[PDB]
Enzyme design. Structure first.
Site, PDB file in Angstrom:
ATOM      1  N   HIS A  62       0.849  -1.242   0.020  1.00  0.00           N
ATOM      2  CA  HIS A  62      -0.067   0.116   0.167  1.00  0.00           C
ATOM      3  C   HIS A  62       0.856   1.162   0.280  1.00  0.00           C
ATOM      4  CE1 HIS A  62      -2.379  -3.334   2.366  1.00  0.00           C
ATOM      5  NE2 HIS A  62      -3.174  -2.805   1.369  1.00  0.00           N
ATOM      6  N   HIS A  92       5.409   6.933   6.711  1.00  0.00           N
ATOM      7  CA  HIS A  92       5.241   6.373   5.516  1.00  0.00           C
ATOM      8  C   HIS A  92       4.777   7.689   4.679  1.00  0.00           C
ATOM      9  CE1 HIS A  92       1.431   6.050   7.880  1.00  0.00           C
ATOM     10  NE2 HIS A  92       0.704   6.388   6.767  1.00  0.00           N
ATOM     11  N   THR A 196      -6.192   6.624   7.791  1.00  0.00           N
ATOM     12  CA  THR A 196      -6.832   6.974   6.550  1.00  0.00           C
ATOM     13  C   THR A 196      -6.636   5.808   5.511  1.00  0.00           C
ATOM     14  OG1 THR A 196      -4.694   7.646   5.378  1.00  0.00           O
ATOM     15  CG2 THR A 196      -5.745   9.392   6.554  1.00  0.00           C
TER      16      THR A 196
HETATM   17 ZN   LIG Z   1      -0.796   7.566   5.884  1.00  0.00          ZN
END
Ligand SMILES: [Zn+2]
Length: 258
Positions: A62, A92, A196
């Site tokens: 992801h 990230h 999120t």
């Molecule tokens: Zn994030």
């Protein structure tokens, strides 16, 4: 049929497996500067990364995460709108298929090339896993990335990306100082939100910095060479791994400046 960012498993499909996607405290959100409220009582943010200990960097399918040793009171986030101390566990980014998009939070509808998320968990709860089960479990520092001059402190990250192109790959990533990813000013906007990405838990106190950091076109381009897919599987370039702005639903975004 795992969740993702494609048209078949993207943000618009998440609510089917995670009903909270349509909840009252979802992130990210658009920061409307005219409706945001300047709060003079908001104290300066306290970011202490002097002794943060990075461990590894991995492509989880992801995005790519740089993990830290959160066993000791090393890297901690406190102050600002927080009433507790939070330990850095990892960071990230989210980026787009072109410089014109990539950030999750927006400012007056403006989208940045990318957005950095420094994740910290509340020391009142034992560990990350337990923290995400509480409304004030996490404190995430969001930092926008715009294209311009190169960010020296980001080069080590950029240079290692070719070694973890596909899902499941990782690399040694010790001795990385996250202080090199911060802008000069720590002025910020803050509001109560969520993760999120699924499970989208509403356990986050969001702190988004006013000042974006500048990275070079060469640096951000490297982000776009990553793959969502694993080795040997059909190529699926990792771009546009950002969730769009969600309804504020009367939450109040506060700022430490006018
Ligand atoms: Zn994030």
């Amino acid at each position: 049929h795992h969740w993702g960012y494609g048209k078949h498993n993207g943000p618009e499909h998440w609510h089917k497996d995670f009903p909270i996607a349509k909840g009252e405290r979802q992130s990210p959100v658009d920061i409307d500067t005219h409706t945001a409220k300047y709060d003079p009582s908001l104290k300066p943010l306290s970011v202490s990364y002097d002794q943060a200990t990075s461990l590894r960097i991995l492509n989880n399918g992801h995005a790519f995460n740089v993990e830290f040793d959160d066993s000791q009171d090393k890297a901690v986030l406190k102050g600002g709108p927080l009433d507790g101390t939070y330990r850095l566990i990892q960071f990230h980014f989210h980026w787009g298929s072109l410089d014109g998009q990539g950030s999750e939070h927006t400012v007056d509808k403006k989208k940045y090339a990318a957005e950095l998320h420094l994740v910290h968990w509340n020391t009142k709860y034992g560990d990350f896993g337990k923290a995400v089960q509480q409304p004030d479990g996490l404190a995430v520092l969001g930092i926008f990335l715009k294209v311009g001059s190169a960010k020296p402190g980001l080069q080590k990250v950029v240079d290692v990306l070719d070694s973890i192109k596909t899902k499941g790959k990782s690399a040694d990533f010790t001795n990385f100082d996250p202080r090199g990813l911060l802008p000069e000013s720590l002025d910020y906007w803050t509001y109560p939100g969520s993760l999120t990405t699924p499970p989208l838990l509403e356990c986050v106190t969001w702190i988004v910095l006013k000042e974006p950091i500048s990275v070079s076109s060469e640096q951000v381009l490297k982000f776009r060479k990553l793959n969502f897919n694993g080795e040997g599987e059909p190529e699926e370039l990792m771009v546009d791994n950002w969730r769009p702005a969600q309804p504020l639903k009367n939450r109040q975004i506060k700022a430490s400046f006018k």
